[PDB]
Symmetry: D3
Subunit: 151 residues, 6 copies
């Protein structure tokens, strides 16, 4: 009944370049179930927490201001192996390492403008989802076509 969930974000360059629908469409088409979504400009402090494990890296300060400089689409998607499979659908961290067919492969060039975020582990997803959504903002429901996706 209840399956694995991950945190997915359309970054500000994704919003600005008009790729929200294209990204959602790819996840709907794959078979994953939307559990949460909101549209916000988050605080620099929230992003500092979101990327807390990278607080060490040189790019960290600039990253968090950039990721809070504009609206992002915050999402929670549900389905078997969704944390890892979402990463595959995105490509690699660097669009230059990303295959055609992937989101970053089809749409971006630079690492600092790679339009999308996804949790790198189940445990990360739990933190990120909790950081971005209140429990009551998460919708539990049953997709009608579930039995043609999961046996």
């Amino acid at each position: 009944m209840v399956r694995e969930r991950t945190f997915i974000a359309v970054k500000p360059d994704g919003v600005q370049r008009g790729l929200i629908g294209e990204i959602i469409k790819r996840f709907e088409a794959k078979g994953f179930k939307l559990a949460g979504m909101k549209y916000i400009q988050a605080s620099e402090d929230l992003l500092k927490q979101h990327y807390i494990d990278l607080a060490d890296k040189p790019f960290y300060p600039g990253l968090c201001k950039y990721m809070s400089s504009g609206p992002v689409v915050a999402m929670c998607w549900e389905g078997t192996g969704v944390v890892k499979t979402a990463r595959v659908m995105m490509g690699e961290t660097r669009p230059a390492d990303s295959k055609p067919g992937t989101i970053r492969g089809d749409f971006c060039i630079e690492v600092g403008r790679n339009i999308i975020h996804g949790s790198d582990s189940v445990e990360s997803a739990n933190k990120e989802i909790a950081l971005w959504f209140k429990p009551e903002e998460l919708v539990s429901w049953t997709q009608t076509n579930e039995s043609w996706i999961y046996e």
Copy 2:
């Protein structure tokens, strides 16, 4: 810098059939700016207020229950003439009267399953937005290609 706003919601049949990205895509491709978005299963009572001008019609009670029976994507879109243009993009109330190229025209058959809602006038839009969004949930921002959409 602030333009006309309208309320667009993807209905529970739209969500169920994996048409969220597809609908958002069409509004992005048209040139409109996403101003608000959230994902909820709303109360039957919320839907009663949304459709208050229809409380007399026979189909009303069922409509409000169906429109609250599963999650919906609630959106606010912004741009010159967006209220009327969104209606044009949806088609008619009856999918049977909707032309190919329109959202209802391309994707559905029955009036009771017409996948999308849109405000029918500026005054309706203001009411509907205030009902589904909190003021702080409407995002103020500048799209970079705006000068290629508006002269």
Copy 3:
């Protein structure tokens, strides 16, 4: 529950120009149910029966030999009012009079090369369906998302 049915054929120019998938895609997206499909080079005699009401016309003989000069995709699609709605989805008899968004409007130019056929009435459909399919070749099944297409 068996609903209205109509006969749709991908014409030889449709097959030759690689539009079979695109055409089927449009009917699936619309919500209609594929009830029958086969792939044949039909006899000149079958086509002469199929186009019997136009046997008077000067274009008739060339028409009947052309529609039997190559493989066609024979289909039966099912859904409420599928007969009339399919016509709307196709456009007009002449591509020149078909709107963008419709199949003939989007994909072709001449009346003699208008890639698709559809029944013009419930009774034309019954006769044509009967002409191209044996009863057992019409498949009875339930699409799972039916309750999100029909109320």
Copy 4:
């Protein structure tokens, strides 16, 4: 000139999820020639022959009843090396191991719901083509753009 042929089936979850057009679209775009197609709910016995080499496996019985529980699109596609290339276009047996850009990679999640079938060898194809189609149901024709696909 008749070239290599392979057997492709849209599985019941493919039919149910509205992916028939999308799948055919991919093979037409690739350059392959549709040589055969029919739409059936095949017998459990036919499927037991079709999956004969896996009759040992624990998943086999459920597999054979599931693949005969609903309509499938049976196809024969023709083109050089069509057998192996179709497999590449499908992805791997498990959707989880299939890359984005492939059919199972783009559209599904579980191995038991992997929407499409294709022959794994020239000889598997000959046997399967023979199993699902009567000889006369395989159509001989020349696609006009052949000289732009094959040198």
Copy 5:
């Protein structure tokens, strides 16, 4: 053999918004034959001539500077009724009067940013094509699929 031709331009907002391929794709898909194409930033003087019949209108001076302020895709397309049919595919002069499914209907809001140009008559097309292409820059050739488009 030789069919009607018209002048089509992707305006600077079309180039800037990444819609070149989308527009060409629509004309290739319709069946028209590409006879000429070049990518240039034209002089204000050339545009003054291009729009010479509107030299009277208040918007004329600004129009010609805007249409020469950046690269445009200049094209010549060939096919029956292509002058008039190209106009239909574009929509109306005002995107607000344009239907969904049309280029302007799907993609624009304002009259001053309506991304595409097309000749309004056969006689205009002759002038515009001649203005934008040297005779040797026009390619006469035969599309292989012509006999499936024109009988």
Copy 6:
């Protein structure tokens, strides 16, 4: 403001099969900037120079005749790492080795009919561009969304 350039040409089979918009679309969606474009049927001798490093190989004479036998779209695309990334987007020299998601992977079958050309290195690109474009035919301009592609 001036980035790496590469030469991309849509081959005569690409033109013939209506893949021009489709290819241009993929380069626009990726983030690259169109720097040059023209549409020609080039001389056999021009193609001999284009492929000069291959004059020894057996397939060379036929290749140069085929590559000059119909019109081609000649293009110059600009962006960080565009030379290598364009190759990635095309796939391998043999479509048989090209993955789904790539241009050759999605659209063709044989090595002699592989619809697109791309420079294999910066030095090859410089030579090829100088051969197919005059200096003044390369357009200098600023894309508005560049700051969403490059940080």
